[PDB]
Amino acid sequence: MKKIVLYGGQFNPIHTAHMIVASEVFHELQPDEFYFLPSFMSPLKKHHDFIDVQHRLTMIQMIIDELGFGDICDDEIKRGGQSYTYDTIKAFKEQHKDSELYFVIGTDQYNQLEKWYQIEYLKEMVTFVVVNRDKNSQNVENAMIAIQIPRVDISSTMIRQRVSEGKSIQVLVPKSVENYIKGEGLYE
Amino acid sequence: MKKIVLYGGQFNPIHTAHMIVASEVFHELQPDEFYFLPSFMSPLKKHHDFIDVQHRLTMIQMIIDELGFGDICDDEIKRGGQSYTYDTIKAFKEQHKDSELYFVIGTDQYNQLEKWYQIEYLKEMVTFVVVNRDKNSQNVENAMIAIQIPRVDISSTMIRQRVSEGKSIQVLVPKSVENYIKGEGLYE
Numbered sequence: 605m606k607k608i609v610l611y612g613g614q615f616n617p618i619h620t621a622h623m624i625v626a627s628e629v630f631h632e633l634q635p636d637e638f639y640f641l642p643s644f645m646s647p648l649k650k651h652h653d654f655i656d657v658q659h660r661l662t663m664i665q666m667i668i669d670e671l672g673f674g675d676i677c678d679d680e681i682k683r684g685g686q687s688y689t690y691d692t693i694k695a696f697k698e699q700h701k702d703s704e705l706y707f708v709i710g711t712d713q714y715n716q717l718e719k720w721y722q723i724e725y726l727k728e729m730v731t732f733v734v735v736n737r738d739k740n741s742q743n744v745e746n747a748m749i750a751i752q753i754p755r756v757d758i759s760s761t762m763i764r765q766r767v768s769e770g771k772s773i774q775v776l777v778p779k780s781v782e783n784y785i786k787g788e789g790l791y792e
Numbered sequence: 793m794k795k796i797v798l799y800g801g802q803f804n805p806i807h808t809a810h811m812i813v814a815s816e817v818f819h820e821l822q823p824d825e826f827y828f829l830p831s832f833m834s835p836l837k838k839h840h841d842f843i844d845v846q847h848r849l850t851m852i853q854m855i856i857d858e859l860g861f862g863d864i865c866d867d868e869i870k871r872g873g874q875s876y877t878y879d880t881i882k883a884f885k886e887q888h889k890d891s892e893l894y895f896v897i898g899t900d901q902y903n904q905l906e907k908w909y910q911i912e913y914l915k916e917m918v919t920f921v922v923v924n925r926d927k928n929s930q931n932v933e934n935a936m937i938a939i940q941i942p943r944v945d946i947s948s949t950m951i952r953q954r955v956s957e958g959k960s961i962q963v964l965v966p967k968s969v970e971n972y973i974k975g976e977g978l979y980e
C-alpha cells in the first residue's frame with residue numbers, strides 16, 4: 605500500500621533539472637515518502653579515488669529545503685562500495701515491507717537497464733518511473749510509469765565543467781547550492 | 793561605449809527559462825545595464841481585451857531580486873498599443889546616446905525576424921543577441937551575437953496551461969512567482 609519513491613543519483617552536484625524531476629514525479633504520484641538516494645559509487649560511472657559524501661549530502665538537503673518535500677536515504681553512503689540498486693532495494697524493502705516501491709530514472713538509464721546488476725530481479729521489486737531526458741517524451745512498457753517533464757538539458761557534468769572553466773552556474777543550480785559551491789571551492 | 797542590454801518579452805509569466813537566458817547573456821556580455829523590457833502588446837501574438845501590467849511587473853521584479861542584477865524598462869508599458877521594437881529602440885537610443893544597444897531574442901524570434909516592423913532599420917540600431925530555443929545551439933550571421941545556453945523547454949504558455957488545469961508549476965517558475973500566481977489566482 606503506502607507509496608515510497610526513491611530517486612537515485614550521483615548528485616555531484618544536484619541541480620535544477622534534478623529538482624524538476626523530483627517535483628513532477630512527486631506531484632504526479634503523491635507518494636507517502638520521497639527519498640533522494642545518493643550513491644557512494646554509481647555503477648557504470650567513473651569515480652575519483654576519494655569519494656566525497658558530506659558536500660553532496662549538504663547540497664541535497666538544500667534542494668529538500670527548497671522543494672518543501674523529501675528525505676535522504678543514506679543506505680548507499682553507509683554501505684560503501686559499488687552502489688548496486690538491487691542490493692539497496694532488497695535491504696530497503698526488508699525495512700519497509702508494507703510499502704510499494706518506485707524508482708525514478710531518466711531516459712539515459714532506461715536505455716541501458718539491461719546493463720544493471722540483477723535487473724531481472726530488480727524489475728520485480730520496484731516500479732520504474734521514467735522521465736524524459738534529451739527528448740521531449742519517453743515511451744515505456746506497461747509495467748513501468750512514464751512521467752513527461754519539460755525538457756531541461758542540465759547535467760552534473762555541465763555544472764562541474766562550467767565551475768572549472770570559471771563560468772557562472774546561476775539558476776542551473778539553486779542560489780543556496782551556487783553560494784555553497786563557491787564558498788567551499790568545489791570543482792575548482 | 794557603455795553596453796546596454798534589453799531583453800524583450802510578454803513575460804506572462806516570466807519563468808526559469810527567461811532567468812537562464814538573462815543570466816547567461818549578462819555574464820557573457822558583462823553590460824553596464826541590463827533591462828527586462830515587458831511589452832504592452834508583443835507584435836505577432838494575440839492578447840486579451842484587458843492587458844495586465846501590475847502582475848507581470850511584480851513577477852519580473854521578483855526575478856530581478858533572485859538574479860541580483862537587472863532593471864525593468866517601462867517604455868512599452870507607458871506607450872501602450874502594439875509594442876514595435878523599432879519604435880522603442882528609436883526613442884530609447886535618443887535618451888541613451890553614446891551607448892551600444894543589444895537586444896536579446898531566442899531562436900523562434902530569430903527565425904521570423906523578417907516579419908518584424910522596420911527590421912532593416914532595426915538591424916542597424918541594435919546588435920541582436922540570439923539564444924538557442926528548442927535546439928542545442930544557434931548559428932547567426934557576423935553582425936549578431938549567438939549565446940549558447942543549456943536547452944530549457946519552458947514557455948509562458950506552458951505555465952498558464954499547467955495553472956489552468958490545476959497542475960503544479962514548482963521550479964518552472966521561482967518559488968516567489970509560484971506563490972504569487974497562486975495567491976493572486978492568475979491564469980485560472
Ligand SMILES: Nc1ncnc2c1ncn2[C@@H]1O[C@H](COP(=O)(O)OP(=O)(O)OC[C@H]2O[C@@H]([n+]3cccc(C(=O)O)c3)[C@H](O)[C@@H]2O)[C@@H](O)[C@H]1O
Nearest residue numbers: 612613614615621646647688689709710720721737756758
Ligand atoms: N536533465 C535531466 N532530465 C531528466 N533526467 C535527468 C536529468 N539529469 C539527470 N537525470 C536523471 O536523474 C538521475 C541522476 O543522474 P546521475 O546522477 O547521472 O545518474 P546515475 O547516478 O549514474 O544513476 C542513477 C541511479 O541509477 C543507478 N544505477 C545506474 C547504473 C547501474 C546500476 C546498477 O545497479 O547496476 C544502478 C545509480 O546507482 C543511481 O541510483 C538519473 O536517473 C538520470 O537519468
Ligand SMILES: Nc1ncnc2c1ncn2[C@@H]1O[C@H](COP(=O)(O)OP(=O)(O)OC[C@H]2O[C@@H]([n+]3cccc(C(=O)O)c3)[C@H](O)[C@@H]2O)[C@@H](O)[C@H]1O
Nearest residue numbers: 800801802803809834835876877897898908909925944946
Ligand atoms: N525557453 C526559452 N529558451 C530560450 N529563449 C526563450 C525561451 N522562452 C522564451 N524565450 C525567448 O525569450 C523572449 C521572450 O519570449 P516571449 O515573451 O514569447 O517573446 P515575445 O514577447 O513574443 O517577443 C520577444 C520580443 O520581440 C519583440 N517582437 C516580436 C515580434 C515582432 C516585433 C516587431 O517589432 O515587429 C517585436 C517583442 O515586442 C518582444 O520585445 C523571446 O525572445 C523568446 O524567443
